[PDB]
Symmetry: C4
Subunit: 30 residues, 4 copies
């Protein structure tokens, strides 16, 4: 439930690495 919630938050803190890095891809092409 809470350890569910805290371990989404730690999927979101992945998507927010893969956010930063595939922005930093485009920022490459430009």
């Amino acid at each position: 439930x809470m350890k569910x919630i805290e371990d989404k938050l730690e999927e979101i803190x992945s998507k927010x690495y893969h956010x930063e890095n595939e922005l930093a891809r485009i920022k490459x092409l430009l």
Copy 2:
């Protein structure tokens, strides 16, 4: 409340697909 919170987290884990894919649109145009 908690099943509210855990099912936002699963809206955020949509916006973080539509994040990855409409980055991967731009990364198309370039």
Copy 3:
């Protein structure tokens, strides 16, 4: 605390509009 958490989640579901729309700006310029 929980109504704190559920109303960040509803700041994140703003930043994830302003995510979608300022991607959809760049996707404008291209």
Copy 4:
């Protein structure tokens, strides 16, 4: 646990500044 969760939410409300600003980098190059 909850003060864990509320202080990820406040890592996510960083990554969602560094989101807005490194979009607003690309939106610079274009």
